[PDB]
């Protein structure tokens, strides 16, 4: 899972 | 044991596409700790928004936003390389601390949340509403958003092959190929999951030198  | 301190609602952050990501779960017992590892979205991204959101929606901004803070100087990488470890954790006062910290640079940053701030005893019930009302809707949401990431790596993985297959792969392949990665860019960018899905279809198939060769 990926934040931006 | 009369009573219980509990989260009324879920506790997380934004998560690439939008998506409200959970850490602590509704009805959870303070004092409590969870921690996730998360990464970058973007290559040689030097920096993570972590935004803190409460509610029970997928979408992120259909949740209430607690606050948000950066954590900078993260090394340069690909995307998806980068070792994020995110934790909520709320002491038995109700307080709420969120830290992300890169695990590579051992840099942190922190945010503290009073007891107080958020949804109020109305709001909240409102929100649980909404969630049974808007179930259908957030999973089509959800499912989406998972096709757009998808389609993302897919494109994204697709361009790196191409990189280093470079001579390998027959003129005519490459062709195929660079149309299909522009569509499939095309597609990512609008909201019809059916044609990102129709262009993942018409890559897979034209790509079926490009995979030999990464063998």
Redesign the interface.
Known sequence: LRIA | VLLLDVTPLSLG????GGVM?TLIAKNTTIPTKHS?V?????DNQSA???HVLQGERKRAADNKSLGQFNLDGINPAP??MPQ?EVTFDIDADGILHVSAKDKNSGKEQKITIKASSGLNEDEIQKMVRDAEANAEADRKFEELVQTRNQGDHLLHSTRKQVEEAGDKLPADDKTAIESALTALETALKGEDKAAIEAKMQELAQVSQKLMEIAQ
Do not use: K, L
């Open positions: 952050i934004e998560t690439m990501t996730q998360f990464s970058t979205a973007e993570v928004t972590i995307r998806g994020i």
